[PDB]
Each structure stands twice: as structure tokens, then as C-alpha cells.
Amino acid sequence: VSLMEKLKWKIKCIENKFLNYRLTTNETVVAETEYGKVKGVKRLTVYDDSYYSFEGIPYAQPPVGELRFKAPQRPTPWAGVRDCCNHKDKSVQVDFITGKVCGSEDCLYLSVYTNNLNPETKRPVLVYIHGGGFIIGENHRDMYGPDYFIKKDVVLINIQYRLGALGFLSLNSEDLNVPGNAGLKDQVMALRWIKNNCANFGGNPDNITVFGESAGAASTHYMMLTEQTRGLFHRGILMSGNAICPWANTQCQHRAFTLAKLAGYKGEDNDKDVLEFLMKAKPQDLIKLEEKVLTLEERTNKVMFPFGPTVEPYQTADCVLPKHPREMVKTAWGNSIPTMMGNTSYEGLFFTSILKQMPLLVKELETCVNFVPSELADAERTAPETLEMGAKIKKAHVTGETPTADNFMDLCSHFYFWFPMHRLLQLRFNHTSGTPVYLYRFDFDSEDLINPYRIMRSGRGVKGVSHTDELTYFFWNQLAKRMPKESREYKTIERMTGIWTQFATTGNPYSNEIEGMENVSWDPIEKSDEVYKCLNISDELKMIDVPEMGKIKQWESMFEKHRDLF
């Protein structure tokens, strides 16, 4: 991020300080939880709405010392009242704007929001799991403010969970009890807290919706796959992601050793000596080195993060992922709850800045071997079969005689999002009770209202709807402003939160009370459908055939000889 955007960010952080004080009221309230009482407070919004706010509710013991890299433990209860009028630290991470390590190991908290603590009827509960590649993110309201959602009569809960190597270190040796996925286990403990405590805030424990974007969508999907969460919630929404995405998991068991070596470890490649080393290290020191762990080959093979969700090397009581995601789909309890999935209309547009900085990436489309699904390719990417499959991908996305940045970004939309969605839909149809899945396509472009990911990506002035652009219309953030009610942006906020709230309530995203839906016939996708239908969300709401269908089928064709792997 440039100096100019850094200095502006800093000014916005100071302004958000002052705004937050002005919107804090003196109406404190006290709620009961299974571990003790919590004090929260009424806050106002810039639209002059109000909501009750509880931040910093612990759902697990701080994972420090001997608990580092381990499954979460339940928290210590308290006899008095805990002050929850203020946020806690985020998980240790690199700050996307400053580039400095920030956060704390003491990060296992959630926040609860609602416009009415004592409603006549218990309300739908929506739980947001934030994205950020499993390496950044938070539930702070300067990024994820509930100010738009609390216009609806819902309970909204935003959770945190361990990130990076501290959340996703994995070691083969069963004796060490570091199987991996600690951060996903964090999410599990949070969802258990929510089911067992949302009643205290007017929530219906029998009508919970989990949703998330990007890594939060992969997370929502993991929470729909694992037996650990069976029946804990009742709808799911996957926004630009799922667990089949190539970036959403990784067999990272050898990278603990690699990280240790980067941090100055001398010794053998041996799980116990490496763990004992990492257990001593300053948490900041490990997180700063994480961007250096992936090898050239791994990066070439499109492995996106060194640590992340993994198939656990051995089964334990708290095992979240005992098998690969595709195998887990075959028995998943979440296949049989109402589900909504969607993507934006130009997902890969996110990588505009990366392609300007490393223009030689475009030459990857000369053969496209690096984008062949890794289960079909070779690490070398030189096998004749890999070349043949790469030629198929190239036909799908290279439009002229010279591959272009636009072509690269289009390819990325499919590699990272549309193709794994198609794979998931087809696999799920074979293993479900018949509960509906609805598709949306977010296609609303504005720069009058933005969110911090646009700064992170240097995407100001870039026309089109990138990965993360829809979040602006769901959550307040410290770059936002009050929009006029007749503005296209305000209308889109009402539409997006209205649709999500409607789906959370009934399992059907359609509502006649949502402006622009008068002629919308939004049917769920059927197994028999050759072509997916979706609600395209622009200035108008229109049911259309997914424009991406043709390319989706071309990617599918790579599995013609290997249909069991599709």
C-alpha cells in the first residue's frame, strides 16, 4: 500500500476513534452467559439506528504457553460482571496496511449485536466468520460493523479464531497432539457457545445461519462438513468460496520444519524438536516469517498459503477434518440444510495490482500448466498429460493470439472460485436430502462506497466487481459514510441485508418486500439442470443463466478420463 493511502488510513483510524465515542451511549446492559455475566452497551449508527453491543466475550481459554498450537479449551468462568463494551485484540497477523505484525495470541473472542435484547419472539441468529486467507482478519467494528444488519430484527454474531501458523500448524507425530486445524476447532467451540448461549440475547437456537466470505466461506463450509457440528445450525451461506477451492486447504505438515529453520532452528527434521523450538518463539517472530515459507515450486503450483486447513494425520476426539473435503461431502450433515452460494461478476480482478507488479505472470497462460488441478498434474508440470489439460484451460480463457492480464484474471475467477463451486454443487447433489441450494451473482459496481480490501489491493479506480467488493454492502467499516436513501448504494445495502436476513429466517432468499424482486422467480438449482440459474444483483435484480457456464463446462472436461475425481 502506497504512502498516500497509508497516511489517509491513519487519518481514518483517528476519525473512527471520534465517531465511535460519539455513537457510544450510556445505556449499559447486563446479559447472562454460561460462564458468567457480561456488560454491553447501546450504540448508535450514522443512520440514527441503535443496537446493543457486546464485544470480547471469551469462548475459549487464551491459547498461550502450553496451549499454543493445541485445540482450544473451555474458558475460566467468572462470578462478577465482565466488561464487554470494548473490543479485544485480533489474532497475530501482518497488518495489511502498515506491513507490521499486530495482534495477540489472546484472541479467542466473539461479539454479539442486536437491536432488541428482549424480543417478543426469539430471532434468527446470523453468525459471520471472517475471511482473510486464514492469515488476516478480525471482528473489530472498524472492519465488520453490524450497523446495517441491526436494521433487521436479527441477532448478529462475529467470531474470531486463530490465524496463520498459530492456528494451523500441523505435525504428523501423534504423541505431540498438534494434528492441525486448531483455528477450525476454535470456530467449532464458538458455534457451540452460540447454540448454548444465543437465547440470552433473544436469539433462536433452533434457527442459526452461518455465513462467511472467501476463507470465511471455506470456514462456513467446513462447519457444514464436520461431524463435530452436526445439527448446530440450520442454514449456510458461502460467499465466494468453499472447502473444495484449491486455496482452502493444504498438506502443510513439513512446513513447521521450514518455518523453524527460518527462525534460526538448528537440528533434524523431527516433529518433537521442531515443536519444542516453535513453542519457545515469540509469536510475532513466527508470523513475520510466514510469508517466506512457501518454496518457489509451491508458489508455481499455486499453493497460496503455507499454513491452513489440512487433512489431519491421525484421528482425535476433536478432529475436524479426518478426510479430504470431497470425501467429507459424501457424508456431510450440512448437505441437508438450506444453502445459498454465490460469487462476484469479476472475482479475479482482485489480482490487478499483482499483475502490474509481476507482469511475467501473464506468460503462465502460454501453456496454462500451472493451473491444471493439482490432483491431475505433476509437481514439475511438464508431463504431456498436463500440457494437454493446460491447452484446454488456455482455450477457455485466452481470447486472442497473445495472453493478456484480463485473460489471466478471468482464468483466476474460475480456478479459484467458479470451478470449485461447480464441483461442490455436483458432488452435493449426489449426497443430500433434497434441501435447496440457491445461487446469486453479485454484479453491482460502485466506488462511492468501499471497504478496506480495496485499499489493500490498490484497487481504487478499477472498474468491475472484484473479490471482496460485496462486503461493503453488508458491513459498516471505517471508510464508509452515510449514504442518501435514494442512492444506488443504500438500495443495495437494503437488498443484500434483506436477502440474507430473509434466507436466515426461512431458508428461501426470496421476498416480495425486498425492492426490485417483483418479477424475480428465484428457483433452487436442481440435479437435472444442465445450466445453473442465478440471481444477478446489479442496479436491477434479474434471474439469468450463469454467464460463466461455458467455461465451467470446459474446466469439467479435464476430468473426462478421471470422473471419480471430479
Side-chain angles (χ1 to χ4, degrees):
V1 179
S2 68
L3 181 56
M4 286 310 103
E5 296 292 278
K6 281 174 174 191
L7 298 174
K8 290 190 290 168
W9 183 252
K10 155 167 158 337
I11 300 186
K12 283 292 182 190
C13 294
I14 299 293
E15 288 173 357
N16 207 237
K17 252 75 141 227
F18 283 78
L19 181 55
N20 182 74
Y21 179 76
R22 283 182 57 89
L23 301 168
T24 303
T25 78
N26 290 319
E27 292 201 339
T28 58
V29 294
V30 175
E32 300 283 335
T33 86
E34 71 182 291
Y35 300 114
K37 289 172 292 188
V38 296
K39 175 181 73 136
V41 63
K42 180 177 283 184
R43 303 183 179 283
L44 318 176
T45 72
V46 296
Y47 291 104
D48 305 312
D49 302 307
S50 69
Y51 62 102
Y52 297 93
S53 170
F54 302 81
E55 299 173 283
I57 307 186
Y59 65 82
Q61 180 77 5
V64 281
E66 292 294 292
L67 282 179
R68 183 188 284 171
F69 307 124
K70 318 300 192 310
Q73 286 186 342
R74 300 176 83 242
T76 287
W78 55 93
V81 182
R82 189 178 194 89
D83 186 304
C84 293
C85 295
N86 274 127
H87 65 82
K88 281 295 195 161
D89 322 339
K90 53 184 65 179
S91 183
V92 192
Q93 58 194 275
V94 186
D95 188 315
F96 60 142
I97 318 294
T98 66
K100 317 303 196 231
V101 180
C102 66
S104 164
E105 284 188 279
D106 191 339
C107 68
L108 300 186
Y109 299 96
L110 50 83
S111 295
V112 182
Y113 315 109
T114 178
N115 70 30
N116 194 337
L117 273 165
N118 195 32
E120 256 70 41
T121 68
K122 297 281 189 187
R123 286 175 173 182
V125 179
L126 288 77
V127 185
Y128 190 72
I129 310 174
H130 68 81
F134 301 104
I135 62 176
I136 58 174
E138 62 285 300
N139 62 6
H140 298 180
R141 283 175 307 103
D142 51 15
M143 317 291 173
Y144 298 102
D147 306 46
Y148 309 157
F149 269 117
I150 59 94
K151 289 175 166 295
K152 298 296 209 175
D153 288 343
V154 301
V155 177
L156 177 56
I157 306 171
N158 296 66
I159 69 171
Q160 284 187 170
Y161 60 92
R162 281 174 281 176
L163 305 175
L166 291 173
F168 292 93
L169 202 86
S170 178
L171 298 168
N172 285 313
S173 183
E174 185 163 350
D175 308 306
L176 305 176
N177 194 25
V178 185
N181 300 331
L184 282 174
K185 303 184 177 179
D186 291 342
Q187 302 180 5
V188 165
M189 187 161 295
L191 291 189
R192 289 168 172 164
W193 183 100
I194 292 168
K195 198 165 201 294
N196 200 46
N197 291 280
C198 61
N200 296 316
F201 304 84
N204 191 355
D206 295 328
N207 201 19
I208 299 170
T209 295
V210 180
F211 71 123
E213 188 265 353
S214 192
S219 292
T220 297
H221 191 211
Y222 285 126
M223 294 304 108
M224 292 172 77
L225 294 176
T226 184
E227 291 290 326
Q228 296 287 358
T229 55
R230 179 178 288 268
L232 282 177
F233 57 97
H234 310 88
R235 293 87 169 79
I237 312 172
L238 311 182
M239 310 169 65
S240 302
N242 63 64
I244 314 300
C245 294
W247 50 263
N249 54 92
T250 179
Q251 298 309 114
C252 52
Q253 289 69 36
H254 183 56
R255 308 194 179 113
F257 170 75
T258 300
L259 172 58
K261 291 299 278 267
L262 276 164
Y265 173 75
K266 312 299 171 167
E268 305 298 331
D269 184 11
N270 174 265
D271 288 348
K272 186 166 173 185
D273 296 336
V274 169
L275 180 58
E276 287 173 356
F277 172 89
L278 296 164
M279 286 297 283
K280 314 187 195 88
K282 288 167 83 55
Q284 298 83 10
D285 286 352
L286 300 188
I287 295 310
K288 188 47 167 195
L289 301 166
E290 205 174 289
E291 62 189 83
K292 309 171 187 69
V293 168
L294 290 170
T295 66
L296 217 190
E297 186 166 328
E298 282 168 331
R299 301 168 192 269
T300 299
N301 277 266
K302 300 295 167 273
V303 175
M304 201 182 179
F305 313 102
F307 302 96
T310 198
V311 179
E312 299 179 50
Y314 53 89
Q315 270 53 257
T316 59
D318 312 315
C319 179
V320 170
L321 307 181
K323 294 194 148 35
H324 282 270
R326 282 187 67 255
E327 304 308 319
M328 291 187 65
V329 171
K330 295 170 184 193
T331 57
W333 73 268
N335 291 343
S336 300
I337 68 182
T339 296
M340 180 162 57
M341 310 182 186
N343 304 303
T344 72
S345 56
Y346 201 171
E347 293 274 2
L349 181 55
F350 199 92
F351 310 110
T352 285
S353 79
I354 283 159
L355 287 171
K356 296 183 185 173
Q357 270 229 244
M358 287 169 285
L360 287 181
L361 278 179
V362 175
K363 288 200 176 58
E364 277 191 332
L365 271 60
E366 284 174 12
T367 66
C368 292
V369 296
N370 292 342
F371 286 106
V372 174
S374 63
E375 55 261 60
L376 303 180
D378 65 307
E380 248 202 56
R381 304 276 169 163
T382 53
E385 198 164 358
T386 309
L387 272 173
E388 294 162 6
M389 284 173 190
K392 292 188 168 185
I393 298 174
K394 187 178 176 183
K395 280 184 183 70
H397 303 285
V398 176
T399 47
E401 292 178 318
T402 301
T404 70
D406 272 48
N407 294 348
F408 188 103
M409 294 190 280
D410 186 41
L411 195 162
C412 284
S413 305
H414 287 266
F415 181 75
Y416 292 118
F417 301 105
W418 289 102
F419 190 47
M421 180 199 85
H422 175 54
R423 295 179 80 166
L424 169 60
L425 290 163
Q426 292 307 312
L427 191 53
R428 180 199 168 278
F429 276 137
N430 288 344
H431 304 102
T432 175
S433 74
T435 54
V437 49
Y438 299 86
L439 291 184
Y440 70 87
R441 182 176 187 268
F442 188 82
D443 187 30
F444 178 86
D445 190 18
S446 167
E447 284 171 2
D448 274 7
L449 195 66
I450 64 163
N451 75 62
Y453 277 116
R454 187 177 298 243
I455 303 313
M456 188 190 70
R457 76 182 222 242
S458 294
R460 280 196 170 272
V462 181
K463 298 183 181 56
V465 187
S466 298
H467 191 62
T468 75
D469 281 355
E470 84 274 38
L471 290 176
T472 307
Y473 308 102
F474 286 97
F475 297 102
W476 172 268
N477 73 75
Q478 73 173 18
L479 307 184
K481 64 174 165 293
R482 198 200 170 128
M483 295 306 281
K485 285 196 304 156
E486 333 83 46
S487 71
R488 50 196 297 269
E489 294 76 14
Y490 186 92
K491 284 171 184 319
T492 301
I493 292 170
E494 291 277 36
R495 285 166 173 181
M496 296 313 284
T497 56
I499 290 178
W500 264 231
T501 281
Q502 172 60 221
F503 180 65
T505 300
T506 72
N508 183 340
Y510 164 73
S511 166
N512 52 80
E513 183 64 13
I514 302 180
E515 268 200 353
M517 261 172 158
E518 287 85 354
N519 287 312
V520 166
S521 299
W522 197 353
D523 295 328
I525 307 306
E526 276 313 333
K527 192 179 192 308
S528 59
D529 301 349
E530 287 205 26
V531 176
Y532 299 143
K533 293 183 184 322
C534 67
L535 179 68
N536 198 76
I537 300 163
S538 185
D539 287 271
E540 81 194 356
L541 311 176
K542 202 141 298 184
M543 296 298 306
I544 73 179
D545 284 338
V546 166
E548 285 74 18
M549 205 70 207
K551 291 162 185 171
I552 289 173
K553 294 306 288 195
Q554 293 175 254
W555 280 73
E556 177 179 359
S557 73
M558 281 181 282
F559 289 82
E560 188 174 320
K561 298 148 62 181
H562 312 279
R563 288 294 293 179
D564 57 310
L565 299 179
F566 169 57

